[PDB]
Amino acid sequence: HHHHMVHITLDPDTANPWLILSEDRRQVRLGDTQQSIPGNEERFDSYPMVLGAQHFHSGKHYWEVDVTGKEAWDLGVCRDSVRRKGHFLLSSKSGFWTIWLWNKQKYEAGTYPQTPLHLQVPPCQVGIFLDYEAGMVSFYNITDHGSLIYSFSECAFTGPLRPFFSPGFNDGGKNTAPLTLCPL
Ligand SMILES: CNC(=O)[C@H](Cc1ccncc1)NC(=O)[C@@H]1C[C@@H](C2CCCCC2)CN1C(=O)C[C@H](N)c1ccccc1OC
Description:
By secondary structure, this protein is mostly beta strands. It has one domain: SPRY domain (Jelly Rolls), CATH 2.60.120. Helices cover 0% and strands 35% of the residues. The strands form two sheets. The chain has a seven-stranded antiparallel β-sheet with strand order 1-2-13-4-9-10-11, with no helix packed on it. Strand 9 (125-131) and strand 10 form a beta hairpin. The structure holds ligand A1I4X. The site of the ligand CNC(=O)[C@H](Cc1ccncc1)NC(=O)[C@@H]1C[C@@H](C2CCCCC2)CN1C(=O)C[C@H](N)c1ccccc1OC has 12 residues, from strand 6. Belongs to the TRIM/RBCC family. This is E3 ubiquitin-protein ligase TRIM21. Residues 6-184 form the B30.2/SPRY domain.
């Protein structure tokens, strides 16, 4: 899957305004306050969420994310069509294919309802693989020899798809650290 590597740039036009993106659009973290930026149609308004600029219409695509020091986060892909504005449940039923950590050490897949995961090694790095034609998205524990964390299959897929990130909420005080997309 390593050879299907893709270079992803976070899109500030989708970014929830509490989010702070590094200049190179390779890092995202949650600010202590809220940016003043357009209320445009792509912007996630309710939750600290951001997409990659990239759209996947076909083919196989792979990337990695550092989560070192983080008590919560959310990673995966979603339909370009997913709703941006207002409250919703993160799941395949809303057109997102994600896993997450919340409340330090509780890992779960975004099934409806959510599936708790039994991991042997807390991941410091997460790999995300998309096979469009096979309607598949899978999550590997880079820290544990690239062991499969979880796989969504028979996803079908018709629209364009988007990479998806949240550095999580900081209700904790201790989730300040950013997500980082690893150079590969
Ligand atoms: C709390 N309900 C849940 O089961 C999960 C839990 C969850 C936590 C973390 N990662 C994924 C899932 N929440 C959601 O699906 C969404 C996304 C979530 C975000 C995502 C990453 C940034 C920080 C947290 C916060 N969340 C809501 O708050 C929903 C919300 N409560 C709501 C859903 C419907 C109808 C009215 C409604 O509230 C008005």
